Amino acid sequence: YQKLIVYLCDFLEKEVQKRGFKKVVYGLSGGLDSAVVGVLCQKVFKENAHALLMPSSVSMPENKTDALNLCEKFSIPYTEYSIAPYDAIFSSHFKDASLTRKGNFCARLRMAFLYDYSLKSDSLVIGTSNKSERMLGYGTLFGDLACAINPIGELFKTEVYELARRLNIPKKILNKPPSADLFVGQSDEKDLGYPYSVIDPLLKDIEALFQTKPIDTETLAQLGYDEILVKNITSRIQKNAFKLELPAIAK
Amino acid sequence: YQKLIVYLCDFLEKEVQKRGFKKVVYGLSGGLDSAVVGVLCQKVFKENAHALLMPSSVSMPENKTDALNLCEKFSIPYTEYSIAPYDAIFSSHFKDASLTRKGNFCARLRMAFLYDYSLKSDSLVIGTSNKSERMLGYGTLFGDLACAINPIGELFKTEVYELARRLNIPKKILNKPPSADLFVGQSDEKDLGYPYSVIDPLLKDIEALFQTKPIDTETLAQLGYDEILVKNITSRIQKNAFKLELPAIAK
CB contact under 8 A, A149 and B248: yes
Q: Are A237 and A137 in contact (CB under 8 A)?
A: yes
Residue among B15, B44, B114, B142 with most chain A CBs within 10 A, to mutate: B142
Angle at Cα B141 formed by Cα A120 and Cα A29, nearest 5°?
65
Residue A201 has φ and ψ, to the nearest 5°, of -50, -40
Round to whole Å and give the CA distance between B31 and B39.
Answer: 12
Q: Are A152 and A251 in contact (CB under 8 A)?
A: no
Closest by Cα among B114, B109, B138 to B41: B114
Q: Which helix (H) or strand (E) holds A231?
A: helix A227-240
**Alpha-carbon distances, residue B132 vs A31, A90, A251, B82, B138 (angstroms):** 41, 34, 14, 28, 9
DSSP annotation of B55: -
Q: Which residue of B has its CA nearest to A9?
A: B250
Nearest-Å Rg of the Cα atoms of chain A is 18
Technique used by the depositors? X-ray
Torsion of CA A35, A40, A41, A43, to 10 degrees: 130
Round to whole Å and give the CA distance between A242 and A90.
Answer: 27
DSSP annotation of B47: G
Round to whole Å and give the CA distance between B22 and A39.
Answer: 45
Q: Which residue of B has its CA nearest to A102?
A: B116
Residues from chain A that touch B153, judged by Cβ atoms under 8 A, are 247, 249-250
Establish whether A29 is an annotated binding residue.
yes
> What is the arrangement of strands in the sheet containing B24-27, beginning at the earlier edge strand?
B78-80, B49-53, B24-27, B124-125
Q: Are B115 and B26 in contact (CB under 8 A)?
A: no
Establish whether A172 is an annotated binding residue.
no
Round to whole Å and give the CA distance between B181 and A69.
Answer: 42
**Alpha-carbon distances, residue A86 vs A81, A93, A109, B14 (angstroms):** 11, 11, 8, 37
Q: Are B22 and B141 in contact (CB under 8 A)?
A: no
Q: Write out the DSSP string of A47-97.
A: GGEEEEE---SS--HHHHHHHHHHHHHHT--EEE---HHHHHHHHHH-SS-
Q: Which residue of A has its CA nearest to B87?
A: A86
Closest by Cα among A6, A13, A81, A73 to A48: A13
CB contact under 8 A, A142 and B115: yes
Q: Coil, strand or helix: which one is A119? A: helix
Angle at Cα A245 formed by Cα A244 and Cα A246, nearest 5°?
130
Residue A195, burial from CB neighbour count under 10 angstroms (0-12, 13-18, 19+)? middle
The three state secondary structure string of B137-206 is CCCCCCCCCCCCEECCCCCCHHHHHHHHHHCCCCHHHHCCCCCCCCCCCCCHHHHCCCCHHHHHHHHHHH
Q: Are B233 and B199 in contact (CB under 8 A)?
A: yes
Q: Coil, strand or helix: which one is A21? A: coil
Kindly give the pairing relationship between strand A124-125 and strand B24-27.
unpaired
Contact residues, chain A to chain B, C-beta under 8 Å: 7-8, 11, 15, 19, 81, 85-86, 89, 93, 98, 100-101, 104-105, 108-109, 111-112, 115-116, 119-120, 127, 141-142, 146-154, 242, 244, 246-251
Residues 6+ apart with CB under 8 A from B202: B220, B225, B229, B230, B233
Closest by Cα among A44, A133, A45, A116 to A79: A116
Establish whether A154 is an annotated binding residue.
no
DSSP annotation of B223: T
Task: Indicate the residue type of B159.
Answer: E
β-bridge mates for residue A96, sequence order: none
Round to whole Å and give the CA distance between A33 and B85.
Answer: 33
Round to whole Å and give the CA distance between B220 and B202.
Answer: 9
Angle at Cα A221 formed by Cα A219 and Cα A222, nearest 5°?
65
DSSP annotation of A126: B
Round to whole Å and give the CA distance between A68 and A72.
Answer: 6
Measured over the CA atoms of residue A168, residue A173, residue A176 and residue A182, the dihedral's sign is: negative
Kindly give the pairing relationship between strand A149-150 and strand B248-249.
parallel
Round to whole Å and give the CA distance between A99 and A175.
Answer: 25
**Alpha-carbon distances, residue B63 vs A132, B78, B221 (angstroms):** 45, 15, 39
Nearest-Å Rg of the Cα atoms of chain B is 18
CATH of domain A1-245: 3.40.50.620
Round to whole Å and give the CA distance between A49 and A45.
Answer: 5
Q: Are A67 and A29 in contact (CB under 8 A)?
A: yes
Round to whole Å and give the CA distance between B29 and B68.
Answer: 10
Round to whole Å and give the CA distance between A112 and A116.
Answer: 6
Round to whole Å and give the CA distance between A233 and A200.
Answer: 10
Round to whole Å and give the CA distance between B48 and B50.
Answer: 6
DSSP annotation of B81: -
DSSP annotation of A192: T
CB contact under 8 A, B148 and A248: yes
Other Cβ atoms less than 10 A from the Cβ of A214: the count is: 7
Q: Write out the DSSP string of A149-187.
A: EESSTTS-HHHHHHHHHHTT--HHHHSSPP---SSSS--
Q: Are B99 and B183 in contact (CB under 8 A)?
A: yes
Q: Coil, strand or helix: which one is B126? A: strand
Where on the phi/psi map is residue A204: left (φ > 0), alpha (ψ -120 to 50), or beta? alpha
Contact residues, chain B to chain A, C-beta under 8 Å: 7-8, 11, 15, 19, 81, 85-86, 89, 93, 98, 100-101, 104-105, 108-109, 111-112, 115-116, 119-120, 127, 141-142, 146-154, 242, 244, 246-251
Q: Are A109 and A142 in contact (CB under 8 A)?
A: no
